């Protein structure tokens, strides 16, 4: 039921749960765009749970309590891109100064 939502700490745990459910629902919809979901019913269930938690939060205050303190391979590819750009710029400037 929904009475179990009034009992818990409505300050910080509920909003973290909302964020986790939003992330999971987004992943679920992404899987729905693909073939591997296999559980149609979860989308509406999560949507209704999110609606209920939003209502119970709105009865008191806002959803976004951001005032608090709310991959890794990117570094390698970014280093490669920066190196390539640096090399291109260096050779361009070297040719430009060699022109005269």
């Amino acid at each position: 039921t929904v009475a179990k939502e009034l009992r818990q700490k409505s300050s910080e745990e509920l909003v973290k749960l909302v964020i986790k459910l939003k992330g999971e629902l987004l992943e679920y919809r992404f899987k729905l765009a693909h073939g591997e979901l296999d559980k149609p019913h979860l989308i509406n269930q999560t949507r209704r749970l999110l609606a209920t938690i939003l209502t119970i939060l709105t009865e008191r205050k806002l959803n976004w309590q951001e005032e608090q303190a709310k991959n890794e391979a990117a570094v390698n590819a970014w280093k490669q891109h920066l190196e390539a750009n640096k090399a291109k710029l260096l050779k361009s400037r070297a040719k430009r100064e060699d022109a005269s």
Partner: protein
């Protein structure tokens, strides 16, 4: 930071041709009111990779099901294509 601008990633033959290269192109369908920077921020905060190029395009509503005793209209759609630095690929 709501992630309410990524509806569905499409999978067509043009896409399949697109990722086979060295850039690993990605394409999403986006809320028609979200701009380039919004999509860039959402993509950065959903996978952790800062995109290099972000491009957008639109599809006008088109008449579909011409003979049905009720002429329906195709829904307005906006697509955002995101490209990454060469040499990386991430699952969805």
């Amino acid at each position: 930071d709501v992630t309410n601008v990524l509806l569905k990633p499409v999978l067509t033959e043009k896409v399949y041709f697109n990722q086979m290269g060295e850039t690993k192109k990605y394409v999403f369908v986006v809320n028609p009111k979200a701009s380039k920077t919004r999509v860039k921020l959402a993509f950065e905060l959903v996978y952790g990779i800062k995109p290099l190029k972000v491009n957008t395009l639109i599809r006008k509503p088109t008449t579909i099901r011409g003979g049905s005793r009720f002429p329906g209209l195709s829904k307005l759609e906006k697509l955002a294509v995101i490209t990454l630095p060469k040499g990386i690929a991430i699952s969805v």
